[PDB]
Motif scaffolding. Structure first.
Motif, mmCIF file in Angstrom:
data_model
loop_
_atom_site.group_PDB
_atom_site.id
_atom_site.type_symbol
_atom_site.label_atom_id
_atom_site.label_comp_id
_atom_site.label_asym_id
_atom_site.label_seq_id
_atom_site.Cartn_x
_atom_site.Cartn_y
_atom_site.Cartn_z
ATOM 1 N N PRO A 1 0.837 -1.200 0.000
ATOM 2 C CA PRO A 1 0.000 0.000 0.000
ATOM 3 C C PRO A 1 0.878 1.259 0.000
ATOM 4 C CG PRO A 1 0.136 -0.850 2.218
ATOM 5 C CD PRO A 1 1.009 -1.735 1.366
ATOM 6 N N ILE A 2 0.399 2.307 -0.670
ATOM 7 C CA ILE A 2 1.201 3.493 -0.993
ATOM 8 C C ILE A 2 0.594 4.742 -0.350
ATOM 9 C CG2 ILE A 2 2.260 4.818 -2.873
ATOM 10 C CD1 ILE A 2 1.222 2.390 -4.718
ATOM 11 N N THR A 3 1.452 5.661 0.112
ATOM 12 C CA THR A 3 1.040 6.901 0.790
ATOM 13 C C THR A 3 1.609 8.140 0.070
ATOM 14 O OG1 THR A 3 1.270 5.646 2.856
ATOM 15 C CG2 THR A 3 0.780 7.999 3.056
ATOM 16 N N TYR A 4 0.697 8.949 -0.469
ATOM 17 C CA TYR A 4 1.026 10.140 -1.261
ATOM 18 C C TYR A 4 0.939 11.402 -0.423
ATOM 19 C CZ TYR A 4 -0.305 6.737 -4.839
ATOM 20 O OH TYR A 4 -0.416 5.603 -5.618
ATOM 21 N N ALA A 5 1.919 12.294 -0.576
ATOM 22 C CA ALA A 5 1.904 13.600 0.089
ATOM 23 C C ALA A 5 2.641 14.674 -0.729
ATOM 24 C CB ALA A 5 2.512 13.488 1.478
ATOM 25 N N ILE A 6 2.186 15.922 -0.614
ATOM 26 C CA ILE A 6 2.880 17.064 -1.206
ATOM 27 C C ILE A 6 3.935 17.483 -0.193
ATOM 28 C CG2 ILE A 6 2.676 19.463 -1.990
ATOM 29 C CD1 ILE A 6 -0.299 18.802 -2.666
ATOM 30 N N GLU A 7 5.198 17.181 -0.468
ATOM 31 C CA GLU A 7 6.282 17.494 0.455
ATOM 32 C C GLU A 7 6.514 19.005 0.528
ATOM 33 O OE1 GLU A 7 10.047 15.584 -0.485
ATOM 34 O OE2 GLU A 7 11.039 16.557 1.220
ATOM 35 N N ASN A 8 6.616 19.641 -0.631
ATOM 36 C CA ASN A 8 6.921 21.058 -0.719
ATOM 37 C C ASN A 8 6.163 21.681 -1.882
ATOM 38 O OD1 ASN A 8 10.058 20.214 0.476
ATOM 39 N ND2 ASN A 8 9.017 22.031 1.276
ATOM 40 N N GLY A 9 6.341 22.990 -2.034
ATOM 41 C CA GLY A 9 5.891 23.709 -3.209
ATOM 42 C C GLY A 9 4.542 24.371 -3.085
ATOM 43 N N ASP A 10 3.807 24.054 -2.024
ATOM 44 C CA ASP A 10 2.448 24.552 -1.866
ATOM 45 C C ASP A 10 2.281 25.044 -0.444
ATOM 46 O OD1 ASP A 10 -0.336 25.002 -1.896
ATOM 47 O OD2 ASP A 10 -0.823 22.860 -1.768
ATOM 48 N N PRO A 11 2.827 26.229 -0.119
ATOM 49 C CA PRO A 11 2.844 26.690 1.257
ATOM 50 C C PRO A 11 1.510 27.194 1.748
ATOM 51 C CG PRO A 11 4.419 27.899 -0.139
ATOM 52 C CD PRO A 11 3.426 27.225 -1.021
ATOM 53 N N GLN A 12 0.625 27.569 0.841
ATOM 54 C CA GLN A 12 -0.659 28.079 1.254
ATOM 55 C C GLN A 12 -1.715 26.994 1.181
ATOM 56 O OE1 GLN A 12 0.025 31.362 -1.532
ATOM 57 N NE2 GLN A 12 -0.735 32.809 0.014
ATOM 58 N N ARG A 13 -1.291 25.758 0.920
ATOM 59 C CA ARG A 13 -2.181 24.613 0.875
ATOM 60 C C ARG A 13 -3.355 24.859 -0.066
ATOM 61 N NH1 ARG A 13 1.978 23.745 3.241
ATOM 62 N NH2 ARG A 13 2.235 23.097 5.425
ATOM 63 N N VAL A 14 -3.046 25.141 -1.324
ATOM 64 C CA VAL A 14 -4.056 25.414 -2.323
ATOM 65 C C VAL A 14 -4.578 24.109 -2.885
ATOM 66 C CG1 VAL A 14 -4.517 26.495 -4.579
ATOM 67 C CG2 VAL A 14 -3.062 27.656 -2.916
ATOM 68 N N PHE A 15 -3.692 23.128 -2.997
ATOM 69 C CA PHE A 15 -4.027 21.873 -3.623
ATOM 70 C C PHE A 15 -4.165 20.762 -2.603
ATOM 71 C CE2 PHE A 15 -1.351 24.264 -6.639
ATOM 72 C CZ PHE A 15 -2.255 24.398 -7.685
ATOM 73 N N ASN A 16 -5.138 19.880 -2.827
ATOM 74 C CA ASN A 16 -5.263 18.649 -2.040
ATOM 75 C C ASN A 16 -4.785 17.435 -2.835
ATOM 76 O OD1 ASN A 16 -6.387 19.941 0.229
ATOM 77 N ND2 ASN A 16 -8.460 19.757 -0.599
ATOM 78 N N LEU A 17 -3.910 16.639 -2.217
ATOM 79 C CA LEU A 17 -3.456 15.360 -2.762
ATOM 80 C C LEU A 17 -3.921 14.238 -1.830
ATOM 81 C CD1 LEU A 17 -1.633 13.833 -4.860
ATOM 82 C CD2 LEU A 17 0.251 14.182 -3.254
ATOM 83 N N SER A 18 -4.842 13.404 -2.310
ATOM 84 C CA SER A 18 -5.390 12.320 -1.503
ATOM 85 C C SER A 18 -4.258 11.416 -0.989
ATOM 86 C CB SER A 18 -6.427 11.532 -2.295
ATOM 87 O OG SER A 18 -6.908 10.421 -1.561
#
Ligand SMILES: [Ca+2]
Ligand SMILES: [Ca+2]
Ligand SMILES: [K+]
Length: 206
Positions: free
Chosen positions: A38-55
């Motif tokens: 099973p795999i776990t996805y996350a936005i590590e960097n690049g989106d400081p204002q949390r504009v995007f959601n990555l499930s």
């Protein structure tokens, strides 16, 4: 023993309109682990204002907050998929570009003069110059100037410069509350207006 999960591509690219709705699905960047983990996805960097959601579980990248390209026109997300193991985590990079919508009207420089002056009995006389600016992109921020009254007496140019169309006459009239109209060259155009206060002077003889 171990291979980390591998994203299909090691770098993605994507346009989004600034008018795109919250919750809209932008990209599918799910990976696969070759030994079925099973795999776990996350936005590590690049989106400081949390504009995007990555499930976390699915991999889907959606929009979380409203965009604006006048504030931010570009993002570089650093995304990760991991399986759990000490070094079973891999890195891709999504590169996002925000595209324009005509959501802004021209706005006149409030600091340039309003009170102007031109001599009487003189035509094609320089009255003064206004300017207005529009933050939108391409034709959505190209400004076209026009006069909302006294069109038989004054003309205005593309660079905002105003002239007398005809010899004026102080004794006929000495003040003019002229109206200028800045309009963007967009397909669905927006405009704003500024009132000037023009004064007529006379050559000193008769
Ligand atoms: Ca505009
Ligand atoms: Ca815009
Ligand atoms: K905007």
């Amino acid at each position: 023993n171990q291979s980390p999960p591998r994203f299909p591509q090691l770098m993605y690219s994507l346009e989004v309109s600034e008018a795109m709705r919250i919750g809209a699905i932008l990209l599918n960047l799910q990976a696969t682990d070759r030994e079925g983990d099973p795999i776990t996805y996350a936005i590590e960097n690049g989106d400081p204002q949390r504009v995007f959601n990555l499930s976390e579980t699915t991999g889907i990248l959606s929009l979380g907050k409203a965009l604006d390209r006048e504030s931010t026109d570009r993002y570089i997300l650093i995304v990760t998929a991991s399986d759990g193991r000490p070094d079973g985590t891999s890195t891709a990079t999504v590169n996002i570009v925000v595209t324009d919508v005509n959501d802004n009207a021209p706005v006149f420089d409030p600091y340039l003069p309003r009170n102007l002056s031109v001599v009487e009995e003189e035509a094609n006389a320089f009255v003064g110059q206004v300017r207005a600016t529009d933050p939108d992109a391409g034709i959505n921020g190209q400004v076209h100037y026009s006069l909302g009254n006294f069109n038989n007496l004054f003309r205005i140019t593309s660079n905002g410069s105003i002239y007398t169309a005809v010899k004026l006459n102080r004794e006929a009239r000495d003040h003019y509350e002229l109206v200028v109209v800045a309009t963007d060259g967009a397909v669905h155009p927006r405009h704003s207006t500024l009132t000037l206060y023009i004064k007529v002077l006379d050559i000193d003889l008769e």
